[PDB]
Amino acid sequence: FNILLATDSYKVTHYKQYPPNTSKVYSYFECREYEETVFYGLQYILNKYLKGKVVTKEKIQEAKDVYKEHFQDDVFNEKGWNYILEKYDGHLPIEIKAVPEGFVIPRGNVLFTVENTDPECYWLTNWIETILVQSWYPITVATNSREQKKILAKYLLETSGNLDGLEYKLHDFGYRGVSSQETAGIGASAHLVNFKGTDTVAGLALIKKYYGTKDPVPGYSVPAAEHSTITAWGKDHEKDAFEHIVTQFSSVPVSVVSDSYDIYNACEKIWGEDLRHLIVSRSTQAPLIIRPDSGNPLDTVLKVLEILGKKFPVTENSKGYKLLPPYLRVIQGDGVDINTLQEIVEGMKQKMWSIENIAFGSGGGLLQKLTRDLLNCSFKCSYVVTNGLGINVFKDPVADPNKRSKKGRLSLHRTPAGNFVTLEEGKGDLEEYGQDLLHTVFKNGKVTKSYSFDEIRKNAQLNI
Ligand SMILES: CCCc1cc(=O)[nH]c(Nc2ccccc2F)n1
C-alpha cells in the first residue's frame, strides 16, 4: 500500500492552488441533513493506512513515476512528500479529532475533523480526504443495520411482549454480494455492531485485529444447506437430501433451503408429512429452520406459515399471536432490504403471526445496495490560516442549500435537553456548552485513542 497513490488524481495538483502563505487547512466530515448515524469504521482506516511510517524514498519514487505518465507532466509534489520523510520519518503531521465509535449522532453534525500540525503540510489535510471519506461505508452499513433492528424490535415487542433473540433476527448473507474481500470484512463488522449473526467470516478477523471483543468471536452461525447440497441428490430425491441433512445436524439448529423445485410441496408434503417425525422430535435448542428463497418475499412467507400452521401444532402466545412449535422456525433471506423487511413484519402482524417465528437473512441489501449519497457523507474545508490569519471558509451553492458547508473551527456538544449541537466559528471556545465530544484519535502518525468492539456495541445500543 502506497498512500501517495491512494488519493483522487486531481488532489496531486492542489498544493499549487491554495492561497500563497497558507499554514493551515482544517477540514471536517459530516452526514449532511435516517435521522441519526452510527459512527463506526474510522479506527480501522487509521491503523491500516494512516499510522506509522507511511512515506519511504521508494514510495516517493514510485508515485513520481506513475504521476509523470498519468498526467503526461511533472506536477507531483516530490518536495512536500520528501519533507515529511526527512522531518517526521515518514509519519503524517496530521491531527484527527473524532466522536467516540459506536456513538449515535443526528444528521448534520461534526463527526471528525482533520488538520495539519506542520505549516509546510497545509496540502496534506485534503490529500487524505479520499481515504477518510470511505468511512461513509462502515457508517452507512452500521446505521442501515441499526435502523432494521429498530423495525424488528418494534414488531417483536408488539407480537411477543419482549426482545428475546432480537440480536439474531437479521443475519448477514452478503459475502458473495459485495464488491471485494476488503468490503466484506468492513461491511460485516459494521453489521456486527448491532447483531450477532453473520455468514461473512471476513468480518470476524477484522474485529479481532482492529477492535477486539472479550468473547472469542463477535458473530455466530449454524449449519445450513444451499441449492447445490439439495439438488446434487437429484430432483426425485429431495426428501432423501432433507432427511440426510437434518440427521447429520440432529442436535444443533439447521436451516434447509426448501425452494429448489416447489417450496409449498416441500413444506406440506416433505416436511409436513414424509419427514414430520424427524422434526417433532427435535429439541428447542436445535430447531429445523425452513428457508424459502424465491417468489414475492411477503406472499411466500405468509403461504409457508399457513401451510406449516396446518401441519404442525400451533399455539397462541400471551399477546394473541400465532406461534409455531419451538422445534420449527422460518428464515427469509431472499430479496431482503430495509423496505422489504418492513413489509414482511407488517404483513405477518396483520395475519396474526408472531415475529418470533421468523429470522431474516440479507446479502446485497445489507452490504452493497448502499451509497455515499444515502447519508450525504461529506468532507469539506471549514477553516484556513493564511498570512497568520484564520478565516472561516465554506461552500454555499446557489442551486442547492443542502450542500452549504459549516464555517470555521468546529466542536460537538450535548445541549441542555441532552441533544447534540455542532458549534461553528470556534464558538466552542466560549465554554457555554459542555466538554467537546470530539477526542484526538490520531496525531503525528500515531493512534492516540482506541475503542474496543464491546464499547462500540454498548454505544450503539437501542434505547429499549
Ligand atoms: C442462520 C445462519 C446460517 C445460514 C442459514 C441459511 O439458510 N443460509 C446461510 N447462508 C447464506 C445463504 C445464502 C447466501 C449466502 C449465505 F451465507 N447461513
Q: Where are the domains of the chain?
A: 1-133+372-450, 134-371+451-464
Asked if 361 contacts 226 with a C-beta cutoff of 8 angstroms, the reply is no
Asked if 272 contacts 309 with a C-beta cutoff of 8 angstroms, the reply is no
Q: Residue 435 is placed in which grid cell?
A: 466538554
Give the Cβ contact number of residue 273 at 10 Å: 11
Q: What are the CA-CA distances from residue 329 to residues 116, 139, 165, 290 (Å)?
A: 55, 32, 13, 6
Give the Cβ contact number of residue 411 at 10 Å: 21
| Sign of the four-CA dihedral 301, 303, 307, 309 | positive
3-state SS class at 416: coil
- Whether 73 has a binding-site annotation, put simply, is no
173 CA to centre of ligand 1 in angstroms: 6
| Sign of the four-CA dihedral 77, 82, 83, 88 | positive
3-state SS class at 449: coil
- Report the distance separating Cα 176 and Cα 271, nearest Å: 29
- Report the distance separating Cα 310 and Cα 328, nearest Å: 13
Largest CA distance in the chain: 84
3-state SS class at 311: helix
- Report the distance separating Cα 126 and Cα 179, nearest Å: 26
Counting Cβ atoms within 10 Å, is residue 141 exposed (0-12), middle (13-18) or buried (19+)? buried
Give the closest residue to 7 by CA, choosing from 75, 97, 86, 79.
75
**CA count, 13 A, side-chain hemisphere, 222:** 23
Q: How many helices (H) and strands (E) does the chain have?
A: 15, 18
Q: What is the best residue among 168, 171, 176 to mutate for testing ligand 1's pocket, by most ligand atoms within 8 Å of CB?
A: 171
Asked if 170 contacts 177 with a C-beta cutoff of 8 angstroms, the reply is no
Q: Residue 248 is placed in which grid cell?
A: 447429520
Counting Cβ atoms within 10 Å, is residue 146 exposed (0-12), middle (13-18) or buried (19+)? buried
385 CA to centre of ligand 1 in angstroms: 54
DSSP 33: -
256 CA to centre of ligand 1 in angstroms: 9
Asked if 42 contacts 436 with a C-beta cutoff of 8 angstroms, the reply is no
3-state helix, strand, coil in the chain (%, to 5): 40, 20, 40
Asked if 371 contacts 179 with a C-beta cutoff of 8 angstroms, the reply is no
Q: Residue 90 is placed in which grid cell?
A: 515518514
Give the closest residue to 205 by CA, choosing from 165, 175, 229, 234.
175
Q: What is the atom index within ligand 1 of the atom nearest the CA of 289?
A: 7
Structure resolution, Å: 2.0
Residue 211 sits at φ, ψ, to 5 deg, of: -130, -55
Per-position DSSP letters for 326-376, written without gaps between them: TTEEEEE-SS-SHHHHHHHHHHHHHTTB-GGGEEEEESHHHHTS--TTTTT
224 CA to centre of ligand 1 in angstroms: 6
User: Which experiment gave this structure?
Assistant: X-ray
3-state SS class at 135: coil
For atom 13 of ligand 1, the residue with the nearest CA is: 173
Give the Cβ contact number of residue 267 at 10 Å: 24
Q: What is the atom index within ligand 1 of the atom nearest the CA of 256?
A: 7
Asked if 155 contacts 321 with a C-beta cutoff of 8 angstroms, the reply is no
For atom 7 of ligand 1, the residue with the nearest CA is: 255
- Report the distance separating Cα 284 and Cα 132, nearest Å: 46
- Domain covering 134-371+451-464 assigned CATH 3.20.20.70 in the classification: yes
184 CA to centre of ligand 1 in angstroms: 15
Q: Are strands 439-443 and 94-98 parallel, antiparallel or unpaired?
A: antiparallel
Q: Residue 159 is placed in which grid cell?
A: 407480537
**Ligand 1 pocket, CB under 6 A:** 171, 173, 197, 199, 221-222, 224, 255, 257, 291, 331, 333, 361, 363
For atom 17 of ligand 1, the residue with the nearest CA is: 173
* Bridge partners, residue 65, by sequence: none
Give the Cβ contact number of residue 174 at 10 Å: 26
Asked if 382 contacts 393 with a C-beta cutoff of 8 angstroms, the reply is yes
- Report the distance separating Cα 432 and Cα 135, nearest Å: 31
Give the Cβ contact number of residue 400 at 10 Å: 9
253 CA to centre of ligand 1 in angstroms: 12
- The last residues before gaps in the chain (C-N over 2.5 Å) are 33
23 CA to centre of ligand 1 in angstroms: 54
83 CA to centre of ligand 1 in angstroms: 51
Per-position DSSP letters for 257-292, written without gaps between them: E--SS-HHHIIIIIIIIITGGGTTTS-TTS-EEEE-
Write b or e for each residue in 188-220: b if 16 or more Cβ atoms lie within 10 A of its Cβ, otherwise e. bbbbbbbbbbbbbebbbebbeebbebeeeebbe
Asked if 54 contacts 91 with a C-beta cutoff of 8 angstroms, the reply is yes
Q: From the centroid of its chain, how far is CA 201?
A: 15
- Report the distance separating Cα 280 and Cα 263, nearest Å: 20
454 CA to centre of ligand 1 in angstroms: 25
For atom 10 of ligand 1, the residue with the nearest CA is: 173
- Whether 176 has a binding-site annotation, put simply, is yes
- Report the distance separating Cα 94 and Cα 303, nearest Å: 58
For atom 9 of ligand 1, the residue with the nearest CA is: 224
Q: What is the best residue among 178, 195, 226 to mutate for testing ligand 1's pocket, by most ligand atoms within 8 Å of CB?
A: 226
Q: What is the atom index within ligand 1 of the atom nearest the CA of 331?
A: 7
- Whether 401 has a binding-site annotation, put simply, is no
For atom 16 of ligand 1, the residue with the nearest CA is: 173
| Sign of the four-CA dihedral 404, 410, 412, 417 | negative
- AA identity, residue 228: S
- Axis-axis angle for helices 181-191, 136-160 (nearest 10): 40
- Report the distance separating Cα 384 and Cα 93, nearest Å: 16
